[model samples]
Target: QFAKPEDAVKYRQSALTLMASHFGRMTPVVKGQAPYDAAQIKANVEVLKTLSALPWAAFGPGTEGGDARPEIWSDAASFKQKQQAFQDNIVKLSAAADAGDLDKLRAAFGDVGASCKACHDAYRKK
Candidate 1:
């Protein structure tokens, strides 16, 4: 699905920046140190949705540096399955965030990260 190695690399870089931003802002709230704001939660939900939709398949054959691994191309089906699970979990997280349920949001956040970690563990190089 990747047209060029550069394209995939650039896309992943951009997505990573955005995801880092999303996680950075939510860390304090997850720690139970800061109170949740509905508006912030809504914004985070949108950000998570966008991040979850990032085209992971773009980082294919020619893309190798920056933590991407060969398994991304060699084991594509499993990669996509992990991606889908992450997206689905993120959506659930977004919904819980939107509802302003702190308890649910905390659980969803952990689940979301676990989903992401599953993919990274399988396909991302150290």
Candidate 2:
């Protein structure tokens, strides 16, 4: 839906930037680097869940020239699979946060982080 490739690139970057912010808010608590605050965890998870679906849609054809590597379109299936894994992990993370289970939340956060790293490794250009 973007009229220009720059627009799509910008959109997706903004979306991912927001997601990263929420992820940052939760990381300290998830990693036990900071004291666990149920309210903060819950709020961050809510934002993450709400924004979860935005980035992928923004990665349309026009968005190719950014940090996204060519493999995103060339190996579309693998890219989609990685995206699904991220979504699945985020859902689990949200559930864990809702349940107030620190251990489960931490594990889920690890999975979500791994999913992000996997995609970045394969599809993001330095």
Candidate 3:
């Protein structure tokens, strides 16, 4: 429900940027650079789940700009697949956090990262 193209672009930018923010906060834990705090990390992921889902709606027609590539519209199906993969991985991510399983959390975090990178490689311009 964006009122104009700029609104949509701004909305998606906010969503995508914050998605990276929340996910990146866990990078230290993933790298063994910081200790894992299960409850806190789980809370971060709760916001992450909400952030991750907002961009797709903002990607609606006529809202395309920023680093978004034209392939997002031309190669729509694969982009949708990529988006789905991200969502799925984060669902598993939530499960791992809930289980407080570090190894499983790492694995799910990896899946999430791959999906994020895949979309960037395919759909981002720079």
Candidate 4:
């Protein structure tokens, strides 16, 4: 679908934005900041899992604009490692949500957020 570099960048950015939005929807419940709804948590986590792979495919050589840093391409190894960690954490988060276990959700959610931050800290522009 992404035929151009800009296209890939925009696609990735949009996917990430949507992924974050889904994650945000479950944050309040996960953090105990809002009333817990198992259904809502499961729905959001499902969307997160679905969108997990969307951005990575768009992170190829040409997609270098937006908030993505040059290091994503130049230092591919480190960037991929962080990306893999984020993916791994998202899978764990999804599993916890699917199991409908609040405690596990909390732990997995924290790890997912940390994984995101770890990547952003190194690869996103301020």
Candidate 5:
């Protein structure tokens, strides 16, 4: 999708960064620091899903930049496993949000965060 290596790098970073920002806004709600509005959270999770579809494709051939480790290319299968785990948790989070169950939402959110960390721990540079 990107013309140059730099473009690929920038595109992936921007898309993934947006995921973090959009996905991170609910931290307060999950932590009890802000009010829980089920509809709002539901909508935000949909947006997160849209963002979730991005970033991976940008990590295509010759796109070896950002904080990504070389194992993303070297150990491709393992990386895909982590990515799938993270995305699957997002699906669970979406289901929880749709049900409007605060407890379920909190649990799913924590699960997604854990998956994200696990992927980063293995694939991202320090």
Candidate 6:
């Protein structure tokens, strides 16, 4: 969490780095480059779960992040609704991954990504 401008930059940077790594890791598993390990998949699922619940408020309000929109702190209901969608998607993603069903996981991943994009579109600056 970041309550200061510099802190927000650092937090966002960390998230970006971790997310890039996670994506790369997922590619190998999804592409069948390596055997799909349930533990590894679960670990990555945990990372996404952790990410989806990050306290975004710490980076907004007075922070300097370009993606944070002013309306996030102003329109509370709408912001929460967007966040809820992301949360629900994360849960579904975790379940699909746990099941070790590639087809289900793929479909759920797309749904989760869509929810994420929708939230970003509404609450984050373009």
Task: Give the count of colliding residue pairs in each prediction.
Answer: 0, 0, 0, 0, 0, 0
How far residue 79's Cα lies from its native spot in candidate 4, in Å, is 0.6
TM-score per model over all chains: 0.87, 0.94, 0.94, 0.94, 0.95, 0.72
- Candidate achieving higher lDDT, 2 or 3: 3
TM-score of 1: 0.87
Q: After TM-score superposition, what is the CA distance of residue 29 in candidate 2 from its true location, in Å?
A: 1.0
- CA lDDT of every candidate: 0.79, 0.88, 0.90, 0.89, 0.92, 0.71
After superposition, the stretches of candidate 5 with alpha carbons farther than 4 Å from their true spots are none
Best by lDDT: 5
lDDT minimum window of 10 residues, candidate 1: 52-61
Top TM-score model? 5
* Number of colliding residue pairs in model 4: 0
For lDDT, candidate 3 versus 6, the one ahead is 3
Question: Where's the lowest-lDDT run of ten residues in candidate 3?
Answer: 59-68
Model 4: C-alpha RMSD to truth? 1.1
Off by over 4 Å in 6: 1-6, 23-35, 55-64
- Candidate 5 — worst ten consecutive residues by lDDT sum? 1-10
Residues 12-70, model 5: lDDT tens digits: 89998999998899999999999999999999999999999899999998789889899
Q: How many backbone clashes does candidate 3 have?
A: 0
RMSD of each: 2.1, 1.2, 1.1, 1.1, 0.9, 3.0
User: Taking the tens digit of each residue's C-alpha lDDT, what string does model 1 give over 11-122?
Assistant: 8878877886886689789778898887888787887788857756556566876778777778889887888888888888888888888888889888888987898799
